[PDB]
Write an enzyme that holds these catalytic residues in place. Sequence first.
Site, short mmCIF file in Angstrom:
data_model
loop_
_atom_site.label_atom_id
_atom_site.label_comp_id
_atom_site.label_asym_id
_atom_site.label_seq_id
_atom_site.Cartn_x
_atom_site.Cartn_y
_atom_site.Cartn_z
N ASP A 12 4.16 20.95 15.94
CA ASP A 12 4.48 19.43 15.89
C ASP A 12 5.54 19.31 15.03
OD1 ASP A 12 4.34 16.69 16.11
OD2 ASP A 12 2.22 17.07 15.84
N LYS A 13 6.24 17.81 15.19
CA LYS A 13 7.25 17.29 14.47
C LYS A 13 6.68 16.41 13.37
CE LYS A 13 10.80 16.47 16.29
NZ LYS A 13 10.31 16.79 17.46
N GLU A 33 15.41 0.64 11.32
CA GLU A 33 16.20 0.07 10.72
C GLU A 33 15.69 -0.49 9.50
OE1 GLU A 33 18.10 -1.21 14.85
OE2 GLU A 33 17.77 -3.00 13.48
N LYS A 76 26.63 -2.83 15.68
CA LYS A 76 26.23 -1.33 15.38
C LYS A 76 26.45 -0.54 16.45
CE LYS A 76 21.33 -1.73 14.82
NZ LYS A 76 20.89 -0.39 14.70
N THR A 96 5.68 17.99 20.80
CA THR A 96 5.31 16.87 19.74
C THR A 96 5.24 15.65 20.71
OG1 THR A 96 5.92 15.77 17.85
CG2 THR A 96 7.83 15.95 19.43
N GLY A 97 4.71 14.47 19.91
CA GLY A 97 4.23 13.16 20.46
C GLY A 97 5.12 12.11 20.04
N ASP A 145 -0.83 17.97 13.07
CA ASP A 145 -1.57 17.04 11.58
C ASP A 145 -2.68 16.41 12.10
OD1 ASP A 145 0.79 16.15 13.09
OD2 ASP A 145 0.17 14.17 12.41
N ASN A 150 -3.63 14.56 17.92
CA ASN A 150 -3.00 14.65 19.14
C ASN A 150 -2.80 16.06 19.53
OD1 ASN A 150 -0.42 12.76 20.33
ND2 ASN A 150 0.00 15.17 20.49
N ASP A 151 -2.53 16.64 18.63
CA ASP A 151 -2.20 18.05 19.03
C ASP A 151 -3.68 19.17 18.63
OD1 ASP A 151 0.18 17.01 18.45
OD2 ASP A 151 1.06 18.87 19.33
MG LIG Z 1 -0.53 15.80 15.78
#
Ligand SMILES: [Mg+2]
Lengths: 1064, 324
Positions: A382-383, A471, A536, A647-648, A789, A792-793
């Site tokens: 995962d990210k 930002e 920008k 990842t999500g 973490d 989600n996963d």
């Molecule tokens: Mg996760």
Amino acid sequence: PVSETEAYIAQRFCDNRIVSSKYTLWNFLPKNLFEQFRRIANFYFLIIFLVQVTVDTPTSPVTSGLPLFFVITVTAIKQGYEDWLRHRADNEVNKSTVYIIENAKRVRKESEKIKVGDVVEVQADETFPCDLILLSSCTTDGTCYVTTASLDGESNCKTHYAVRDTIALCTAESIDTLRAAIECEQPQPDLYKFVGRINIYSNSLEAVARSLGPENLLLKGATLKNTEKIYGVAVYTGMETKMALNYQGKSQKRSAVEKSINAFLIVYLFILLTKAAVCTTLKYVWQSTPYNDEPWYNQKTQKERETLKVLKMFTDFLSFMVLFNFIIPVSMYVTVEMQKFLGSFFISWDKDFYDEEINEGALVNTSDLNEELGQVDYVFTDKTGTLTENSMEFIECCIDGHKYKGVTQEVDGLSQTDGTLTYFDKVDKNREELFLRALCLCHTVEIKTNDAVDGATESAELTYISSSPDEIALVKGAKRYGFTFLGNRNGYMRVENQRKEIEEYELLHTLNFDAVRRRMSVIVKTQEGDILLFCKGADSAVFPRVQNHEIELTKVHVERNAMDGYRTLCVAFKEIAPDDYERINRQLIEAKMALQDREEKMEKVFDDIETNMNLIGATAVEDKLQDQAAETIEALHAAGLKVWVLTGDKMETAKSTCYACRLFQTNTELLELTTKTIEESERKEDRLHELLIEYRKKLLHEFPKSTRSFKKAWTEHQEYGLIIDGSTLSLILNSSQDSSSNNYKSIFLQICMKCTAVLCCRMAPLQKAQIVRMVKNLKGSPITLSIGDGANDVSMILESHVGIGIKGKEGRQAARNSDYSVPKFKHLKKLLLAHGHLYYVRIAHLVQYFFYKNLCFILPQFLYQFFCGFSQQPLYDAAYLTMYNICFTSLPILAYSLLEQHINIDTLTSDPRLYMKISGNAMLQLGPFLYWTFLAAFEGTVFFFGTYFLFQTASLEENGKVYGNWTFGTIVFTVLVFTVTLKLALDTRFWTWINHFVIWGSLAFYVFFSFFWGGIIWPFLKQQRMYFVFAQMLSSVSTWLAIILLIFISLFPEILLIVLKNVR
Amino acid sequence: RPDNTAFKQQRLPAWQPILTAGTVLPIFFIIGLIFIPIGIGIFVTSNNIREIEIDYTGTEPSSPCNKCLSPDVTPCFCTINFTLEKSFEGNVFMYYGLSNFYQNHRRYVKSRDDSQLNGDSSALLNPSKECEPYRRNEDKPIAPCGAIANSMFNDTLELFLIGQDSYPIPIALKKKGIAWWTDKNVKFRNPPGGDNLEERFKGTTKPVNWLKPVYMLDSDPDNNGFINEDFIVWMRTAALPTFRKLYRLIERKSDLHPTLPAGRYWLNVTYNYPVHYFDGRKRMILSTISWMGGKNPFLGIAYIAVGSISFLLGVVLLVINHKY
Ligand SMILES: [Mg+2]
Ligand SMILES: CCCCCCCCCCCCCCCCCC(=O)OC[C@H](COP(=O)(O)OC[C@H](N)C(=O)O)OC(=O)CCCCCCCCCCCCCCCCC
Ligand SMILES: OC[C@H]1OC[C@@H](O)[C@@H](O)[C@@H]1O
């Protein structure tokens, strides 16, 4: 469809609880037992026990049941401990302190008991115990701020609002607030949409997405920020995440080696079967016709039980198997569980990886997958949450590639201590003015108006709340420099250049950040002059302006910035005329106040307005990692492991941190399967092969080949793999049953495989489980390890062969659901690179050894039947057979399993290239299997034949006497134990001071016990077959010189091997 | 930090000895240099020993005992002349060897009831169940409760010498200690008590095939009831289709002359054990012994091989890695 009663609160609904346990309080035995009988050994001995109830058999039912129950219960306890541990870890979070006041109890309740339709108070910095409906927020505008980094894994914050305000102060004091009610429908698991009505003609709608979506509905683990207390209802939705995770409800007991245990038992059972068949048949045929009653030494009662033509055949078939059933070992499960369990603490009570915070270094969840830990092939990571956190920061901007950063050092310590009166402006006060001004402007920030004590933190709270932190960190960088950006709500971004100067400006118009253009700009009027235009933009969306004076300087630095994984943001501006500004003003309002397809008109006009600008440098920002990328990813790449990221988090930041982790090499000709989704619905079908079949084989046969054992050097690797989105995946997965010209999922995996790595963006947990099962089937079966973490996963932790969790990264709840917990991505290297692989070498050597002992023990017992009148007369003493064999066999081998590293942990940690590739699963493949069995033959045949050869005289004693039957058998038993023990001793490498004692101590136990039994305990017991026979045997120096030769010849091939295996 | 110990962090004192070619190379050389001589030694030692056997079963009308093979008059007799080409001074040992007699057999060894043998009180009363066929006969308890005892080796032998005087010259023999000290004095003893021998067994009949009881075997009581060495050695299951049992023994006299000289000897037997019913032979084997035992060159050649083999192995192991 929910009644949501008005005068009443609720009933007939599913409340919220924590379900992360394997077995249940009531039906655990019907689950554990069936899960336990998948091990053949138990099955074979239970069927044998069952059969031993038909007619009178020599073997008693107790000696047939004891081998089963003594094993069944051990596993039952080491399975129970696990489930009860999960139960306690679930109850703790179930009874969580929760603030709630609706019906009568003014005090705060527990999260364990929260029925549907209950208002719930969520204080500041509180984790949502469940999912609610929000239309009553205390603060003005009923607006709070919540992040969802555990549910969907979004880096951008969530925006929401409500209508009423602090109605709760009246719900507790009065019942007037309990007038409205809510209606629902059949709850859907995905949670994207939930609809209804709320006691009035008003459509209460909501819908989720992978980006910022729902406002009304709240979700679990949705971290709350910038608020005092909020009140919401309808707790039942909390079950949505439960229904999203339930995919992994029951698929627990497995292993990569325990499958081979049963496969081993197959040929072993065939060994038994073969021996039983040969013994029985070769007895009936060889001596059955004339030797049944002729010998006259014995005469069975009633002529061999009226010589039943076939019943005798079966009674002896069993008499043979039950005596030969030691081949099939059952005592190997109790010892294997002792290893599995006593080896768990090696990671638990360990300082090699302990968070300095009270946070626990590791937790052990199951005692069933330890051995297969250091045996993985594929990894799913995962990210955000694991590789990073929901935030971002800026560092070392590049104004014409001039701004740099430094630190304190030995030689350069004078200029860093005190600032010189001349060095304060070399390239700063020339353009940094406009740079930081443009930075503070053209940003839809809208910061807070009130604040806490300015000084609690470094400077002040300084909390600017926007939709995305993209930002939000840029303003913090401006704060790092002289600028500050204070207020700005009703003024044109009042800021302070360097000192405490207000620097007020007027905001005339502000442009939007659309997706077709990918730029953000603002039109403002300065206090000391005319109008300006700040902007920008993206990388190739703003570089369109010519910029002759400054291109290379910024272009190459942007190239290197994006390559290193940053999110390059260019910056520019332009001077607008006073009259042409009015021309633009009019033509813009002509499209704004126009109510006929404004989306196209407005875009064309405000896109052509920006026709040029003045490039003023660039700003690079990075989504910081959680651990160094190279060691974690480089080590796995060298160890062989295939690394994949599913990842999500948004694709932009996804590609960003993935490119930062170096898994995306500099020269990686990437592939995408997301931009061609809305257009050409059936082009992907004929596109997959054009991008992978055509390109891969082209670059594969253009340049030389690329082998499977060693890679990552030749131009073949140039062609990296791909990145897909949840849409194209679910589009190429479920609806790929239309065209039959060429398979689609097959080629999809064909490309996902032969490459550097792959990325799966916009992926749901269920959507990621599909990839897990996608790799879990091709080319036989590799092993999958997943780590995430939050929730989600977490729907991958069990679908993958092994579950690894991190606690507190995003959602902790995901770790107790996992099979292992390690709140450290850096230390995952130590886990699978050392503690697990050791478990593999340990138990692999253990199984080859257990089969080896129970075969070297019984093979002479089988060949002896050749000289016994196939009357299955054991050559071994009755108890001696089981008792000393299990009293010796289990101890030293268990010592090997528990504490032994064929190679130490640090010497293997330093080098994975020479560590994981050599292992593979070859520890128990037909390569070493047939090799070890040879050792079973050679020793089992030499024991027997050698002793029988020396017995050709009947004069061994220094004086000359006969030698009893049990003397011969106890001779082979002796050379047997000495051979197996010394064999293991020669095969071991780690000689710890407590293993050395047990090996020699068990051999001692042998000499000591056999001698004690031989001399005193004869007349007090029931009966004894041999009295002073062991010693009577040891009295002939001949046998000394003989048995030593037997053990030496037994281990000679092993000694040879050792030499070979260690040289060259 | 708080609970850290060496046992919990795999850092215990590791003896860690590691091997290689150069480390075991001598082992092979040394074991060869030790084995080759030891083996050749035991070879010549166990070789020199002189033995001899004769099959007195008949199975050949050519042999004089054949006409005494089939059921003949109960006390059958036969003579088998044999010559001794060499004289062995070493104190000889006499064994009776047999073939196709499956001593090792579940039913044959399970019938032995250590109770009556050891001399237990409650034993004499009732024999155990394991001795299912010979528990009692005509409802009377048998003292030697067992098929092994029932199938005792009773055919006795007599050995004579022939000198210059053609008429016979018998040779003296000693019945003491034909079994080991343990299996005769401690392993088995007489019933609870008795000064005389018959009183020890009141209403106790004997094995079916055995006609004369055990209390009427040997003159001296220290070798008669359940302690008769002949019967005790037979009560030891050899565990082989063919096996040898020690009958008697002719030890040397305290003087220096040669025990058995070279010449013709006379062998007369009492054929009272049939074996042709199952195509089994019967024989007697006389021989000398040493610290090793009678003729058995197995261990000798075995050591010769194992040694020379390991030695040559080291030869190669050396001449190959020396190329470094
Ligand atoms: Mg996760
Ligand atoms: C409180 C202290 C307690 C101490 C223990 C107390 C013991 C009491 C046990 C009472 C049971 C009595 C059973 C009857 C006697 C057993 C007879 C027996 O063993 O038969 C053996 C028979 C033999 O066949 P064969 O001749 O080789 O066949 C040749 C074939 N036709 C051929 O040539 O081709 O082969 C067979 O057909 C088998 C027939 C049945 C055998 C039953 C034997 C049971 C004996 C008990 C053994 C105990 C072992 C330990 C048990 C532990 C329990 C916890
Ligand atoms: O012929 C077999 C003999 O075996 C038993 C013996 O007692 C006699 O009754 C019987 O005649």
